[PDB]
Amino acid sequence: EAADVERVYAAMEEAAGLLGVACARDKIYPLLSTFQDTLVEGGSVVVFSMASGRHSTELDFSISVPTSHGDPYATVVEKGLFPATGHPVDDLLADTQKHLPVSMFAIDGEVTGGFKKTYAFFPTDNMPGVAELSAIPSMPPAVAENAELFARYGLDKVQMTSMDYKKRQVNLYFSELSAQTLEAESVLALVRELGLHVPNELGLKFCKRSFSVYPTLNWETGKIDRLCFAVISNDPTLVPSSDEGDIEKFHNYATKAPYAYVGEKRTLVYGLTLSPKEEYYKLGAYYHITDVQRGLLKAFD
């Protein structure tokens, strides 16, 4: 409703404020208004995320959208909020719902740049494997071409995918991760084969605690762009960095980010991203949570 739109935008401004980032109202309000029906507390998931290093001047936001509301990408294009890219990514969200059971969607953007991404969630008890995903016509060929590698490291079931319309990239969020997969030996071998930044002791300890792992792929080459390990927790001190600046800044955000569910501790999702040239950190502070997050905390925190 109107009040919800205002409440969520005010929260977004508060979160961005902690990072010294200013929101572009003209790029955000129309989007929130368009999806105002999803902003009611309960059943909704909203996350405001910060990052380290060269990615620190931006605040990302992600808002869940029920499938009943319809393809959110189709919505933003038809309403004139975003231009079709003319590339296969334009058809991926639709093709995913066509070929696989999608249980929920999500829209995502940057507070200074606006809408730029969608997510497709799959049922936890009926998740697709790399084979099913590689069959989708508009999926990057890189998914099928890295199938042998994924299998070798136990990256099988995918809980959700995300599509970045501006960068023309796809993330595969692997779940039901085996202990073996997250053991140091496995992680090091994987990063080695992908030619990504080698994590140290602190980084590997963080990887072992992960509940989700996601590589980023593209349509131009079969090479994986980067790999991210995610950790969910109520502990505000987990950023896997030795930098005093990061330690202080992430803890500050973790203990001051806005949240509507007072009476419970803030739900936090940390990320450790490994690219060919470096490693960086992310922290998503949930403004809205559901029982999915409560269950994850009991299982992983």
Q: Indicate the annotated binding residues.
A: 60
Is 89 an interacting residue with respect to ligand T3A (CB under 6 A)?
Answer: no
Question: What SS3 state is found at 8?
Answer: helix
Stretch that binds ligand T3A, among 32-40, 53-61, 152-160, 247-255 (CB under 6 A): 53-61
Binding residues with ligand T3A: total (CB under 6 A): 8
What whole-number distance in Å separates Cα of residue 84 and Cα of residue 77?
A: 6
* CB nearer to ligand T3A: pick between 51 and 231: 51
Q: Which of residues 59-78 bind ligand T3A (CB under 6 A)?
A: 60
Q: How far is the CB of 135 from ligand T3A (least distance, A)?
A: 26
| Concatenated DSSP letters of 18-39 | HTT----HHHHHHHHHHTGGG-
Output the residue with the shortest Cβ distance to ligand T3A: 51
CB 163 within 8 A of CB 93: yes
Beta strands in 138-203 (DSSP E): 158-164, 169-174
What whole-number distance in Å separates Cα of residue 162 and Cα of residue 111?
A: 18
* CB nearer to ligand T3A: pick between 128 and 284: 284
Is 51 an interacting residue with respect to ligand T3A (CB under 6 A)?
Answer: yes
Strand 158-164, strand 169-174: pairing: antiparallel
Q: How far is the CB of 244 from ligand T3A (least distance, A)?
A: 21
* CB nearer to ligand T3A: pick between 35 and 119: 119
Residues placed in the known binding site for Mg(2+): 60
Stretch that binds ligand T3A, among 52-60, 93-101, 231-239, 293-301 (CB under 6 A): 52-60
For residue 8, which amino acid is it? Answer: V
Is 166 an interacting residue with respect to ligand T3A (CB under 6 A)?
Answer: no
Q: How far is the CB of 282 from ligand T3A (least distance, A)?
A: 5
Residues sharing a CB contact under 8 Å with residue 96, sequence separation 6 or more, in sequence order: 102, 120, 136, 161
Give residue 162's Cα distance to chain centre.
7
Q: Which of residues 240-299 bind ligand T3A (CB under 6 A)?
A: 275, 282
CB 296 within 8 A of CB 211: yes
Among 58, 91, 132, 301, binds ligand T3A (CB under 6 A): 58
Stretch that binds ligand T3A, among 50-58, 69-77, 142-150, 188-196 (CB under 6 A): 50-58
Task: Please name the residue ranges forming H helices in 35-146.
Answer: 72-78, 89-99, 130-134, 141-145
- Where on the chain is the footprint of ligand T3A (CB under 6 A)? 51, 55, 58, 60, 225-226, 275, 282
